Design a protein around this ligand. Structure first.
Ligand SMILES: O=C1CN(C(=O)c2cncc(-c3ccccc3)c2)c2ccccc2N1
Ligand code: NA
Length: 127
């Protein structure tokens, strides 16, 4: 069994910026989700070998996880906040697509997503 290479977290080719919104995404949004009791399954790429999920990467072709997002934010990978918001949403969507409603992992994603929406609602206007 084999995992795919993880999503990139640096690309010197890719233009990048710091914005007030990106700083909020790290200091408030990622911080908040990372420390939550339900964060752990989402803190690194899904390890389909260890978890014995050989179909995971046959189903999920756009993987994303908070370990990747954390590294992207700490490296200033992004140009804008919407790229990073999209990453979070990809992560949640992957969980909902792969798993059944009401599975514990889905409950975990839902709790994290509730907090994500709460924080995103007060994203600052750009400086
Ligand atoms: O989307 C996924 C990927 N996944 C995990 O990432 C994962 C990794 N660590 C822990 C959990 C987890 C935590 C509590 C309850 C059930 C699963 C899940 C997982 C593992 C096993 C069975 C189903 C899934 N579904
Ligand atoms: Na599903």
């Amino acid at each position: 069994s084999m995992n795919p290479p993880p999503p990139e977290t640096s690309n010197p080719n890719k233009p990048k910026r710091q914005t007030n919104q990106l700083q909020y995404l790290l200091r408030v949004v990622l911080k908040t989700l990372w420390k939550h009791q339900f964060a752990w399954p989402f803190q690194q790429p899904v390890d389909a070998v260890k978890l014995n999920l050989p179909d995971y990467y046959k189903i999920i072709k756009t993987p994303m996880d908070m370990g990747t997002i954390k590294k992207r934010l700490e490296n200033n990978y992004y140009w804008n906040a919407q790229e990073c918001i999209q990453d979070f949403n990809t992560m949640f969507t992957n969980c909902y697509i792969y798993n059944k409603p009401g599975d514990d992992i889905v409950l975990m994603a839902e709790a994290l997503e509730k907090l994500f929406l709460q924080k995103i609602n007060e994203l600052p206007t750009e400086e």
